[PDB]
């Protein structure tokens, strides 16, 4: 019945103070896997699991270009440690917050969206938002301490995220990113490899390494684009920001 949840989210979004109210009393600390920054693990209980919550660094994405945080999280996600995650999402800056959200859902790993600070906001169409991401979204007004209970309950039930066309990419990029996937070892779930192929094209460095014997084919793939695409790193982050805008228009 033990459970491990990764608490990922943007910086400056009460990820900090949400982590508090979940755990509250029990919060141990440690240095992170061989470096100088702070791993903040905590324990709380639902009426089904004892959750090991793992505070991650604040980060705006998973694109690792040194600026660790992205890599620290990109690692822990791919490590298969977390049973599921919580993406903390501020509603005021949605266009900003949602880049991380789309990457986390493409990676398929079970996620639950904690919608943040909603006294800082007026009101939004949540039911359509969750169904556009294929995961559940719990909205919160935390200073009451209300809605947290719904999020404690949401960790208990959620099995896997719905299978949706989250981002519509141009087929040229998919084509070459699919090929970078087949060169990788099947040790990695095929869903993730498709993702790692696109992060490698975006200019990700931890993916350049994680994929390994495949990054030698990265430059010869990027050459096959230069013909058709002016800059592939942008069209990737663009098509993401396309569906970002498509969502934020459909709920606001």
């Amino acid at each position: 019945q033990k459970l491990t949840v990764g608490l990922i989210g943007n910086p400056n979004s009460g990820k900090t103070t949400l982590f508090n109210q979940l755990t509250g009393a029990r919060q141990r600390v440690g240095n992170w896997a061989g470096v100088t920054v702070e791993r903040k693990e905590g324990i709380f209980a639902t009426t089904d699991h004892q959750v090991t919550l793992v505070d991650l660094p604040g980060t705006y994405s998973l694109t690792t270009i040194t600026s660790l945080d992205e890599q620290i999280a990109c690692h822990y996600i791919l490590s298969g440690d977390a049973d599921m995650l919580i993406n903390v999402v501020d509603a005021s800056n949605l266009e900003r917050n949602l880049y991380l959200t789309l990457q986390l859902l493409e990676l398929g790993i079970p996620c639950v969206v904690a919608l943040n600070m909603l006294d800082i906001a007026v009101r939004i169409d949540i039911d359509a938002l969750a169904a556009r991401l294929g995961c559940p979204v719990i909205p919160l007004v935390s200073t009451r301490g209300r809605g947290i209970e719904a999020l404690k309950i949401a960790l208990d039930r959620h099995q896997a995220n719905s299978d949706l066309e989250l981002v519509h990419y141009p087929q040229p990029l998919l084509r070459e990113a699919d090929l970078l996937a087949q060169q990788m070892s099947a040790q990695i779930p095929p869903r993730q490899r498709r993702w790692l192929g696109l992060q490698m094209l975006e200019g990700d460095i931890y993916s350049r390494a994680y994929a390994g014997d495949a990054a030698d084919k990265l430059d010869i793939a990027l050459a096959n684009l230069s013909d058709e695409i002016d800059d592939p790193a942008l069209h990737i982050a663009d098509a993401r920001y396309q569906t970002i805008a498509a969502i934020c228009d459909a709920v606001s």
Binding site: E95, D238, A245
Partner: protein
């Protein structure tokens, strides 16, 4: 016909320095989406900022 990352690069490619205030109004696009796009490319290394109020231009 709503803005795209490449459309922002192309915008700064001509007018160089440019307030996001201007970019939002000139590209026919909400401000906080343009603000998020710039902040993306900037960390991606594609654009950069200037102060004294904000001004965006191209490159590393």
């Amino acid at each position: 016909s709503m803005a795209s990352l490449m459309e922002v690069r192309d915008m700064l490619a001509l007018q160089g320095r440019m307030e996001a205030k201007q970019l939002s109004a000139r590209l026919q696009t909400p401000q906080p989406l343009i603000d998020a796009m710039l902040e993306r490319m900037e960390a991606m290394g594609k654009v950069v900022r200037i102060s004294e109020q904000e001004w965006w231009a191209l490159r590393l």
